[PDB]
Amino acid sequence: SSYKLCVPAAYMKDCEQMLEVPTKSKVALECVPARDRVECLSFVQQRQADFVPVDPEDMYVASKIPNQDFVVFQEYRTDEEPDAPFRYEAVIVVHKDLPINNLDQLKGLRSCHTGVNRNVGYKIPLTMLMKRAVFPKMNDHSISPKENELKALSTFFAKSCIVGKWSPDPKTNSAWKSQYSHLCSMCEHPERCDYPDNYSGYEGALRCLAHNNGEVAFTKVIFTRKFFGLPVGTTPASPSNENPEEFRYLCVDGSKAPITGKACSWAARPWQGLIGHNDVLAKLAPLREKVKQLADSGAADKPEWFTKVLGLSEKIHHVADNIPIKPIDYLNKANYTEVIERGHGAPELVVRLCVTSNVALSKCRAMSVFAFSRDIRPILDCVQENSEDACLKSVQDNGSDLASVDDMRVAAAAKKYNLHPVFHEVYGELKTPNYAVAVVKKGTAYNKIDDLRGKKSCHSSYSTFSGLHAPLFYLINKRAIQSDHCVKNLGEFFSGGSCLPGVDKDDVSKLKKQCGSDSSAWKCLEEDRGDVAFVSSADLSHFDANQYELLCLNRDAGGRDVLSSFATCNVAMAPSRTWVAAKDFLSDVSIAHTPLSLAQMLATRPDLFNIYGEFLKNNNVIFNNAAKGLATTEKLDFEKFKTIHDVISSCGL
Numbered sequence: 008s009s010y011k012l013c014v015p016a017a018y019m020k021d022c023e024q025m026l027e028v029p030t031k032s033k034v035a036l037e038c039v040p041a042r043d044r045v046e047c048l049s050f051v052q053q054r055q056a057d058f059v060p061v062d063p064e065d066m067y068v069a070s071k072i073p074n075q076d077f078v079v080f081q082e083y084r085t086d087e088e089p090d091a092p093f094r095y096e097a098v099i100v101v102h103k104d105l106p107i108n109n110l111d112q113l114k115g116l117r118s119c120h121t122g123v124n125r126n127v128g129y130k131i132p133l134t135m136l137m138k139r140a141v142f143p144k145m146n147d148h149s150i151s152p153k154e155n156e157l158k159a160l161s162t163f164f165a166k167s168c169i170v171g172k173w174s175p176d177p178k179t180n181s182a183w184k185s186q187y188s189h190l191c192s193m194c195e196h197p198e199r200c201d202y203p204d205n206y207s208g209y210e211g212a213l214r215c216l217a218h219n220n221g222e223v224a225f226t227k228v229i230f231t232r233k234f235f236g237l238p239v240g241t242t243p244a245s246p247s248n249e250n251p252e253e254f255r256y257l258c259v260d261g262s263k264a265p266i267t268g269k270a271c272s273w274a275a276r277p278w279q280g281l282i283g284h285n286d287v288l289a290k291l292a293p294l295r296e297k298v299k300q301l302a303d304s305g306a307a308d309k310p311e312w313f314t315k316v317l318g319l320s321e322k323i324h325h326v327a328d329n330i331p332i333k334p335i336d337y338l339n340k341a342n343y344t345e346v347i348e349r350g351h352g353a354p355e356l357v358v359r360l361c362v363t364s365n366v367a368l369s370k371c372r373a374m375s376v377f378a379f380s381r382d383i384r385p386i387l388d389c390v391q392e393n394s395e396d397a398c399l400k401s402v403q404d405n406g407s408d409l410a411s412v413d414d415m416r417v418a419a420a421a422k423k424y425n426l427h428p429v430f431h432e433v434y435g436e437l438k439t440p441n442y443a444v445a446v447v448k449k450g451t452a453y454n455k456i457d458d459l460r461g462k463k464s465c466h467s468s469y470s471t472f473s474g475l476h477a478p479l480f481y482l483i484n485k486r487a488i489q490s491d492h493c494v495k496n497l498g499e500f501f502s503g504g505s506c507l508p509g510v511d512k513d514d515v516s517k518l519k520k521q522c523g524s525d526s527s528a529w530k531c532l533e534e535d536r537g538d539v540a541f542v543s544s545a546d547l548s549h550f551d552a553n554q555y556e557l558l559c560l561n562r563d564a565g566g567r568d569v570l571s572s573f574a575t576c577n578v579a580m581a582p583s584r585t586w587v588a589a590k591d592f593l594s595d596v597s598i599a600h601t602p603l604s605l606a607q608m609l610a611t612r613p614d615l616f617n618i619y620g621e622f623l624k625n626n627n628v629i630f631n632n633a634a635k636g637l638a639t640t641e642k643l644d645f646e647k648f649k650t651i652h653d654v655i656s657s658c659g660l
């Protein structure tokens with residue numbers, strides 16, 4: 008008989024400290040952990056929890072749960088605008104003398120935007136304008152949905168300022184900034200088209216309009232009012248050099264309205280707040296008093312539970328009780344469901360990820376609904392086969408658009424299904440694939456590969472890339488050993504003997520000769536049973552940084568570098584879990600976009616959706632828990648992986 012608050016598992020301890028905050032309300036709250044907020048909504052519907060903080064995007068996810076009976080019973084507002092129904096209203100701001108009497112006439116104007124993927128300055132304008140025949144269509148399927156929007160904007164407006172990361176892929180973003188440079192010509196620094204830019208953001212858009220001869224600005228009321236020194240909410244009038252009489256809101260009417268009056272606004276971003284199941288009603292006043300009290304006492308400096316558990320913020324923690332409202336009706340009255348459901352015209356593009364298990368299917372579906380609610384496009388669809396090979400076949404057949412493959416199966420999958428890598432996992436704090444490296448003791452006499460001829464080697468297991476593939480390819484490639492009888496010949500290069508676990512299962516007896524009492528590469532190196540250890544960079548924790556170095560077999564100069572420099576002192580880059588796609592359908596940009604937008608949106612917000620976390624007590628579902636990001640696969644890395652595999656297929660290994 009408590010009010011159960013769902014909380015991302017990572018923040019359970021913070022919710023517990025919160026439960027110790029003294030308050031006048033004696034309401035008992037309990038912390039219910041979930042995998043993330045998306046799961047929390049399921050637990051709320053299922054009554055394992057009673058409420059959870061939500062952004063409007065989360066309410067939308069919540070409104071789609073089959074048979075849902077959610078209720079938004081609490082709004083988080085600002086102290087500046089405690090009585091405003093919406094977080095912020097989107098407005099169109101023009102010079103008073105702009106000849107215009109219809110929103111069709113926004114065409115050809117120089118436009119001032121807050122920045123890409125933002126609400127009043129981008130998503131809302133796109134949502135509303137696209138309803139207008141004069142606005143370019145966005146269903147050209149030779150390119151991605153994101154490119155369709157940018158093409159549409161750069162074709163409708165004469166010039167714009169739309170800064171920021173248009174693509175999560177750096178090279179795609181740069182290429183797009185070149186091809187649609189008109190979208191950056193109104194900015195303070197057009198070549199860069201990124202933050203900081205004095206002509207971007209809520210205020211910079213009005214400066215773009217007032218000071219850089221822009222002709223329309225998409226922004227929000229509060230920055231429009233303050234730009235002109237006008238009062239807003241609790242904020243009083245301010246001295247301003249800008250004169251509001253020279254400017255006007257442009258209304259959907261096509262009419263103009265004074266800035267000094269109530270703004271005409273085509274949509275608003277709704278406030279965040281709390282969502283709960285319908286049985287929270289009736290039991291509703293005591294909870295609201297409890298949350299209000301926690302909000303007003305965490306205001307002072309702001310413990311973790313303030314933001315991570317209650318979903319408040321420094322700027323947004325005025326708890327306002329509303330007339331309880333269903334989530335979609337909450338979103339509707341802001342015109343914000345339209346924005347959340349924005350598309351690009353039929354057929355809406357879909358990227359179909361192939362998964363190999365029921366749990367992965369369910370993770371892909373929860374990820375899809377989240378991505379969609381968060382304005383990431385293409386829509387993610389989920390397709391299930393019963394193996395990796397069947398997912399790969401399906402990508403070939405165009406039953407799917409992408410599928411993952413691990414370790415050294417990427418080159419095989421390309422030979423066999425004519426697929427190619429699109430993006431791969433990166434790891435560590437440096438967000439980097441693993442590398443196969445060559446570990447040596449400090450001060451030993453090896454600086455290049457021929458110096459190790461006749462010597463002894465330690466390896467990771469024969470079944471590993473770094474242990475077997477990379478040293479075998481590295482030697483064969485430099486012709487230090489013939490490519491007939493490769494494993495034997497490897498043994499003949501390290502003629503002093505080697506430990507390559509599992510080489511047993513031609514005459515390969517030399518390659519287990521040094522395994523001694525303990526075949527681990529770090530014990531084998533430590534005990535001078537080998538003079539170099541071919542291991543993965545992922546295993547370098549087993550080597551004392553003060554005693555061991557990397558042999559930079561990759562560098563022209565050879566030599567040595569520290570354990571942490573593996574990314575440039577190595578044998579080969581290691582294939583990480585990789586998603587592959589066919590040749591004749593979605594572009595690599597269209598395929599990479601949604602997963603890399605997820606990875607980058609969720610890198611700091613695993614509480615919203617735990618993309619790399621445990622999923623129903625299963626690890627490494629879709630992504631490995633160790634993944635720290637996603638990057639597009641360079642063609643040259645692809646091509647190198649194919650050559651390595653070709654050498655290994657030659658050896659019959």
Ligand SMILES: *[C@@H]1O[C@H](CO)[C@@H](O[C@@H]2O[C@H](CO)[C@@H](O)[C@H](O)[C@H]2NC(C)=O)[C@H](O)[C@H]1NC(C)=O
Pocket residue numbers: 259260271272273274275340341342
């Ligand atoms: C949501 O969108 C509708 C359609 O643009 C807006 O409807 C207008 O509402 C005004 C009141 O400001 C009415 O007087 C007009 O008749 C409506 N105009 C049109 C063109 O339909 C409404 O303003 C929007 N609501 C929000 C909160 O953004």
Ligand SMILES: [Fe+3]
Pocket residue numbers: 125126127
């Ligand atoms: Fe915004």
